[PDB]
Ligand binder design. Structure first.
Ligand SMILES: O=C(O)[C@H]1Cc2c[nH]c3cccc(c23)S1
Ligand SMILES: O=C(O)[C@H]1Cc2c[nH]c3cccc(c23)S1
Lengths: 321, 321
């Protein structure tokens, strides 16, 4: 079975685009892949962070992943700083990286040093779990390239202990675009809040955003990206939330206009978030959340400890006991 | 009681100059100061290292410190990589350092990144134990300046958790110079092996080095650095190993020439190393060495864990449990 590793920034609430694109797919692929979902709070502090904002965000992301259906027995859901192997292996790989290499990553008071030195910690996050696949986007290609190069360098210089990962998302979800800018991807950090639907948006507010999505006044319910990106994006959201095939959606709304479709979709979005946020609040406000995060931490520690120890022996750190 | 922290490079055997200058003084000040003696194997790998050379060197330094009289109950003698707090706190301080700051430290395949990023780990080594004094030389002034600045930055930005250290050696030992270059300090890495006496030199070989020290053919036994640095350096070694006051040495050898003094000193050096190396071999070849290093690791972990947890809470890493 292949191992998947995904790093999760505690720096913002995922949107329904992130849910349709990734989170919902993780809920299915966690049965067929050995999945690690790591809330990277040590990467988060490379940026300026408010320390209560950060601890709250971490719990929030954990709760959102659990509310999505991420299963702490099937997958390993943990907080990066709670597993020392990450900075242990991150330091080991730093020593074999070059300054030039790190500087070229930064391209693709002063400048905080974490912004230059985090890539070997990213590599460590991945290779500690013998990861085969990382489900990231084009913006992370250089980081995986460096990861693979560090693995090759480590194995070449000391001896074979580390596995090279590939960029692969096992089941790509639909691409969800900005509701009032259909040519750009939906983003949680938009300055136009009508562009995205947050998973923690009030369900009535989300339904209004479906209604304020920028489309023609009326038309047929047909999937057509290049000519009607507005209604097409909504069809994608509809398909992402109901699992109805797109051709099935077109056949269901044959002879219908936009108002009926957008009305049904707004109610679908509202019902989805009502159900999602009830699970979210129950995890977020429960004592079991710390029990779950402890269990995930212990699972990750068990696996990454052996990797760290193999690395330490290969470099000659510590003792032979 | 003040806390002292000394980092120990596992990269070479200390000389009798290092013994007279530092190690012997540590054996006394460990009664009056809370001393941490940390074998920094994670700093060692910032340089190119042979991995069996490194693990052996680490054990060797531990044994040399114990053979010197460093007492694992009075002081805390441990290996850096065995205490995760060092890289945990090292990463936290990295995020508040600036690239410019780190680059200016480097001044005072490519360039290994550890050579740029190690200073915040040095700062972490120190401040984890609430250190008041660090017994280092002029070459480390920039590193302590950065340490103090990182502590100020950390306390200013988050809240008061870290203590600023000072450069202070509580009891300075004698300065021991190169045996065949009396104007330079003795150094374990000299290309002229007659210049230094290693603590692991064969005792007969050391006695020959006392005899091959560069001095006048003959003279009085008088301490005179500027005019007779050769015999003066030998008087310093004699004083360092016997604790005989220098004026007492001059009075003892009134009416004596160099051959009698150098003969007595060579025999003193030989007897010292015979006794030193018997203790060294017994520690180096004993099973108790791992017991001792475990105990030191546990002592250091207990203290540095609390510091790390205070730092994590201040930055908002992890969870409030
Ligand atoms: O910001 C992001 O999306 C990246 C954050 C991150 C840290 N460590 C890993 C490992 C695998 C994947 C990712 C990450 S994704
Ligand atoms: O190379 C050396 O001498 C330095 C190595 C080192 C690493 N971390 C500390 C903390 C205090 C003092 C020192 C060190 S001395």
């Amino acid at each position: 079975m292949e191992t998947l590793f995904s790093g999760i920034q505690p720096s913002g609430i995922p949107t329904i685009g992130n849910y349709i694109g990734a989170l919902k797919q993780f809920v299915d692929v966690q049965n067929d892949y050995d999945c690690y979902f790591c809330i990277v709070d040590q990467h988060a502090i490379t940026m300026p962070q408010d320390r209560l904002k950060l601890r709250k965000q971490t719990r929030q992301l954990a709760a959102i992943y659990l509310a999505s259906g991420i299963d702490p027995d099937k997958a390993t859901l943990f907080i990066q700083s709670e597993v020392p192997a990450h900075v242990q292996a991150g330091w080991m790989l730093t020593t074999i990286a070059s300054v030039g290499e790190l500087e070229r990553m930064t391209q693709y008071e002063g400048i905080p040093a974490g912004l230059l030195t985090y890539p070997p910690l990213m590599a460590a996050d991945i290779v500690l779990y013998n990861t085969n696949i990382v489900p990231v986007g084009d913006d992370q290609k250089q980081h995986i390239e460096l990861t693979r190069n560090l693995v090759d360098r480590f194995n070449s210089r000391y001896n074979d202990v580390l596995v090279k990962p590939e960029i692969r998302m096992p089941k790509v979800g639909g691409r969800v675009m900005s509701l009032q800018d259909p040519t750009r991807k939906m983003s949680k950090s938009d300055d136009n809040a009508k562009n995205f639907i947050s998973l923690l948006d009030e369900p009535n507010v989300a339904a209004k955003k479906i209604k304020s999505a920028v489309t023609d006044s009326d038309g047929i319910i047909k999937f057509d990206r290049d000519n009607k990106p507005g209604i097409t994006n909504l069809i994608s959201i509809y398909a992402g939330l109901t699992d109805m095939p797109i051709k099935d959606i077109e056949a269901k709304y044959e002879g219908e206009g936009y108002g009926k479709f957008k009305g049904d979709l707004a109610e679908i979005v509202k019902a989805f978030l009502v159900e999602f946020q009830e699970k979210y609040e129950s995890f977020y406000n429960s004592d079991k959340l710390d029990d779950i995060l402890d269990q995930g931490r212990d699972k990750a520690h068990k696996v990454s400890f052996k990797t760290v120890k193999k690395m330490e022996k290969a470099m000659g750190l510590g003792r032979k006991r």
